[PDB]
């Protein structure tokens, strides 16, 4: 009711290897060509990707930057208020970035900072300007 396990026989397959004399031999030749086709296509992306690998030699170790381990404070020095507005102008609503710039304000502190100073620092106005870019 089923073929021997590991033996592959398909009605579809069978008609295609019987349809004429040399049809079986013909079908294997393509597979022999389909195989060489896909095989040098490998050595050719294996070649392309070996050049790109060489371009990364050194990674980005020289361009990396040390970590600012800085305790996240609560009061808003007028300095930090100004870094905020300019960060909102360049970053819109990405608080993580805004908090990352200021350096010692948590995202929630940034998140509610907009509401408190919103009238005071025309931050709608700033945000629409950020929308324009």
């Amino acid at each position: 009711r089923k073929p021997p396990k590991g033996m592959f026989l398909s009605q579809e397959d069978v008609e295609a290897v019987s349809a004429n004399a040399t049809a079986a031999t013909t079908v294997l030749r393509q597979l022999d060509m389909e195989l060489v086709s896909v095989k040098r296509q490998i050595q050719n992306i294996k070649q392309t990707n070996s050049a790109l690998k060489e371009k990364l030699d050194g990674g980005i170790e020289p361009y990396r930057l040390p970590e600012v381990i800085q305790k996240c404070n609560a009061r808003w020095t007028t300095e930090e208020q100004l870094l905020a507005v300019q960060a909102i102008r360049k970053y819109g609503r990405d608080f993580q970035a805004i908090s990352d710039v200021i350096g010692n304000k948590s995202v929630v502190q940034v998140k509610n900072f907009f509401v408190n100073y919103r009238r005071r620092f025309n931050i709608d106005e700033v945000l629409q300007e950020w929308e324009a870019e």
Partner: protein, 666 residues
């Protein structure tokens, strides 16, 4: 199986059902009540068991009824009918037995039997057993026909049949008890030695045979489950189908490599896109760092925009570094994954040339079994007799297989050297016209009531005919003769002055160089006490080695032997024999096979007897006068010595029934 039921199995009969033959002779019982059938079935089985338990003495009706127990020995016409039935169709008192009551002096009826081959002998002995005038006409100067044994000195080797396929319900087991045959088992182990002369390593040897056996099942699946039985009108042959299965396995090996390497490109090229992000990002980071450095270069104290610029660039550079690090994370998974796929490639090839050559030996064996090249064998039917296999080790005959026919020929009127040239059968009788094989001019005429023809199928197929039938055989019979296959496999006998092979190994192979020469001396047998080695020649090679002198053939044998055992080890043989069965005009073949386009039905068509037209128009339908027997007529057990013997028994019962009358059917 054992008991009364072992007798039914050993007699090729279901112990608990009435056969169709039995129903034909006992319609009252089979159509009666279940109780009667069981009584009968026991009486049948019990009588068989009696005959079986001692087959060197006739089982008379008296002897039988004696040893039944009531209720079974109560109805004595039921016992008498059953004993007569069995005795008639050769199920009891067949072969070689002491008669208790010697044969009545006056004989009724006259039968000419063509051929004293085993099938001929088996009928001849039965018919005479039944009180008929039986004369056999043999073209050869010896009986046995295809059961030939070569003897010279103490060398003894069979050139024809040499194997008994199991005693489990085999008529020859009874015959062996009747006539001592040194029956020695055949140990199944056959090592294979390659063309160079080195034994195939066991790991490879097991690996191929399973593939072989694996391939054979696949064909049977192509045949029964895909109905791949006709291609461009011509019916498919086993050989054809094995190729369409080897091709489809080589196809699959390729489809498997393609869709594997095609997983490497589909990952190598995920990598191509990943390295392009990573090199365009090391470029944005190169630039931003420069910007942050320049922005950081401005010396403080600075305005808050210039101070935002440093912080914003620092965050932006840090964000880009996160990205580039997440991407050489991902670059690591893909880098390993490509190594995994490269590490586990699929099988390079389905079969190596060395592997394929070894397989080709397993196909030689299969062309030995069927005595024909695999292209000829019917895909659907080649194995139709596989259900009726006996059970038991296969055996050989150490004293030669020739003793059985000679044993049977005892007491029979055998006219040796007598080539039947014309069979002439008419509404009133038959006359058979034979000549003397030595001076052929000297002509013989035999008149008789019925002719039983055990001519080999190859003889029957000769064109122009060796034997002419007057009137000609009808189209259904001749068509059957064309359709049926009659093949050929030959043998070479090698007689040495010392054992120089493995004596605990009965048979060892030799692997061919080609597919085309896979049959040429592909297998050797140590089977006899003396230092005699038998080499087979099967397949396409059998038909071609018949055109080559014995010296050239024994040459090719010595060389193969020299490679396996060393040039010094094998000496010249003292006596050598080669068989040419296709050339022999009394056989014109080896044994029948189910050829493509044939079926098992043809084996039944050959067995049907021929009935001639009425001499006077308007006269009543005449009795059948020409009957056939032999290995090509028994569909269940063809191409075998037991099948031939069973065919002879079968015709004798039918012939006797026609001329002596069946009084056991009332």
């Amino acid at each position: 199986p054992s008991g009364v039921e072992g007798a039914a199995f050993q007699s090729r009969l279901p112990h608990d059902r009435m056969t169709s033959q039995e129903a034909a002779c006992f319609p009252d019982i089979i159509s009666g009540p279940q109780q009667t059938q069981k009584v009968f079935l026991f009486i049948r089985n019990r009588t068989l068991q009696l005959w079986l338990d001692n087959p060197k003495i006739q089982l008379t009706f008296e002897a039988t009824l004696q040893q039944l127990e009531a209720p079974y020995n109560s109805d004595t016409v039921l016992v008498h009918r059953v004993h007569s039935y069995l005795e008639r169709h050769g199920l009891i008192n067949f072969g070689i037995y002491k008669r208790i009551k010697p044969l009545p002096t006056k004989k009724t009826g006259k039968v000419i039997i063509i051929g004293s081959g085993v099938s001929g002998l088996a009928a001849a002995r039965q018919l005479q057993s039944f009180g008929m005038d039986v004369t056999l006409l043999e073209a050869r100067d010896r009986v046995g026909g295809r059961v030939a044994t070569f003897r010279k000195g103490n060398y003894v080797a069979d050139l024809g049949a040499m194997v008994v396929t199991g005693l489990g319900g085999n008529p020859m087991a009874v015959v062996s008890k009747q006539v001592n045959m040194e029956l020695a088992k055949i140990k199944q182990k056959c090592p294979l030695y390659e063309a160079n002369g080195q034994a195939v390593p066991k790991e490879k040897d097991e690996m191929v045979e399973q593939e072989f056996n694996r391939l054979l099942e696949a064909t049977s699946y192509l045949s029964h489950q895909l109905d791949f039985n006709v291609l461009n009108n011509k019916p498919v042959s086993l050989g054809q189908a094995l190729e369409v299965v080897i091709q489809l396995q080589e196809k699959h090996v390729k489809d498997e490599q393609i869709e594997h390497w095609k997983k490497i490109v589909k990952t190598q090229e995920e990598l191509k896109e990943l390295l392009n992000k990573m090199v365009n990002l090391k470029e944005k980071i190169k630039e931003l760092h420069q910007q942050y450095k320049e922005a950081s270069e401005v010396k403080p104290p600075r305005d808050i925009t210039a101070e935002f610029l440093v912080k914003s660039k620092h965050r932006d550079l840090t964000a880009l570094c996160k990205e580039y690090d997440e991407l050489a994370e991902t670059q690591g998974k893909l880098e390993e994954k490509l190594q995994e796929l490269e590490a586990n490639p699929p099988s390079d090839v389905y079969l190596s040339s060395r592997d394929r050559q070894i397989l080709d030996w397993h196909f030689a064996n299969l062309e030995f079994a069927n005595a024909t090249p695999l292209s000829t064998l019917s895909l659907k039917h080649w194995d139709q007799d596989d259900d009726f296999e006996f059970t038991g080790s296969h055996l050989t005959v150490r004293n030669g297989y020739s003793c059985v026919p000679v044993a049977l020929a005892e007491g029979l009127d055998i006219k040796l050297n007598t080539a039947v040239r014309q069979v002439r059968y008419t509404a009133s009788g038959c006359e058979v016209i034979a000549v003397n094989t030595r001076s052929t001019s000297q002509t013989f005429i035999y008149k008789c009531d019925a002719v039983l023809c055990t001519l080999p199928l190859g003889v029957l197929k000769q064109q122009p005919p060796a034997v002419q039938f007057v009137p000609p055989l009808p189209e259904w019979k001749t068509s059957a003769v064309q359709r049926m296959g009659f093949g050929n496999l030959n043998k070479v006998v090698l007689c040495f002055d010392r054992v120089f092979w493995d004596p605990s190994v009965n048979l060892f192979g030799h692997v061919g160089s080609t597919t085309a020469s896979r049959g040429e001396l592909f297998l050797f047998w140590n089977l006899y006490k003396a230092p005699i080695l038998l080499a087979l020649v099967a397949g396409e090679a059998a038909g071609i080695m018949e055109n080559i002198s014995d010296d050239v053939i024994v040459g090719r044998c010595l060389a193969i032997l020299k490679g396996i055992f060393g040039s010094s080890a094998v000496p010249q043989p003292k006596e050598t024999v080669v068989s040419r069965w296709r050339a022999d005009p009394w056989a014109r073949g080896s044994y029948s096979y189910v050829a493509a386009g044939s079926s098992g039905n043809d084996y039944d068509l050959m067995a049907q007897p021929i009935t001639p037209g009425p001499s006077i128009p308007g006269a009543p339908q005449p009795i059948p006068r020409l009957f056939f027997a032999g290995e090509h007529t028994i569909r269940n057990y063809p191409a075998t010595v037991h099948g031939a013997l069973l065919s002879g028994l079968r015709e004798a019962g039918r012939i006797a029934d026609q001329f002596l009358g069946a009084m056991y059917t009332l």
